[PDB]
Each structure stands twice: as structure tokens, then as C-alpha cells.
Write a protein that binds this ligand. Structure first.
Ligand SMILES: [Au+]
Ligand SMILES: [Au+]
Ligand SMILES: [Au+]
Length: 129
């Protein structure tokens, strides 16, 4: 599913991400924009052999099981395919664990490089939330 911007904002807000770990909703929408282009089915293989999955590009080395990432963990207790659903519940639940792990949203490299420090409220402009 390719979300619209305000459609994703509403869903993320419903699931309690607005200002989870102190990160405003616009941070999460901006992260999703540059991680996945709002596409729940996005996948991208990394040089280390892990893969990133779904709207927030959650990685198979620590967080989900894809069966092909040696030496990895599955700390979200989910198959990585659950992160590709049109229903973002599993991605949000896992994102909450990740953002709690110590480095906040710096765990998302596109957030650090493209969203951090920017006018992230622009990402929720015009949305009725
Ligand atoms: Au879909
Ligand atoms: Au929820
Ligand atoms: Au949902």
C-alpha cells in the first residue's frame, strides 16, 4: 500500500507515535517519506546482507526474522514480511522498541540525514488530525 501523506499521519497518530519518545508526528512522517516513500511494500538489501522492510525500513539484523540474515536477532518477535502489510500496526510496535533502544530516531539513517533539524512540521501541513 502506498499511503498518502495525511493518511499515514492519521494512522501513525492513532497508533500513538505522535511524540513517542518525544518525537513529534512530523518526524515520523518525514522518516517514512525518506525511508520508504510511504510504500508499505518497500524492501532494500543492505551491504551487510540484512534487509530493511516496510514503511519505516526496519532491519532484519536485530528487529525481525527474514531467514537469511546470519547471526541476527528478532527482537520485535515478527517475520519481516509482517512489516510489509497494508496495516502498519506491526511496524509501529516495532518502531516503538527501536526508538527506545538508546539512540532515538538516529536509528533511522534517512531521518538523521534528511529530517533531523529540519522543519518536520511541514510533513503534517493540511492534515486534519
Ligand atoms: Au499493500
Ligand atoms: Au494501534
Ligand atoms: Au493500522
Amino acid at each position: 500500500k502506498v499511503f498518502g501523506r495525511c493518511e499515514l499521519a492519521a494512522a501513525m497518530k492513532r497508533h500513538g507515535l505522535d511524540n513517542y519518545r518525544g518525537y513529534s508526528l512530523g518526524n515520523w512522517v518525514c522518516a517514512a517519506k525518506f525511508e520508504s516513500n510511504f510504500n508499505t511494500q518497500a524492501t532494500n538489501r543492505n551491504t551487510d546482507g540484512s534487509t530493511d522492510y516496510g514503511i519505516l525500513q526496519i532491519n532484519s539484523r536485530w528487529w525481525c526474522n527474514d531467514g537469511r540474515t546470519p547471526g541476527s536477532r528478532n527482537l520485535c518477535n515478527i517475520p519481516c514480511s509482517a512489516l510489509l502489510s497494508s496495516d502498519i500496526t506491526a511496524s509501529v510496535n516495532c518502531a516503538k522498541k527501536i526508538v527506545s533502544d538508546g539512540n532515538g530516531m538516529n536509528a533511522w539513517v534517512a531521518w538523521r540525514n534528511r529530517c533531523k533539524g529540519t522543519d518536520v512540521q511541514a510533513w503534517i501541513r493540511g492534515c486534519r488530525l
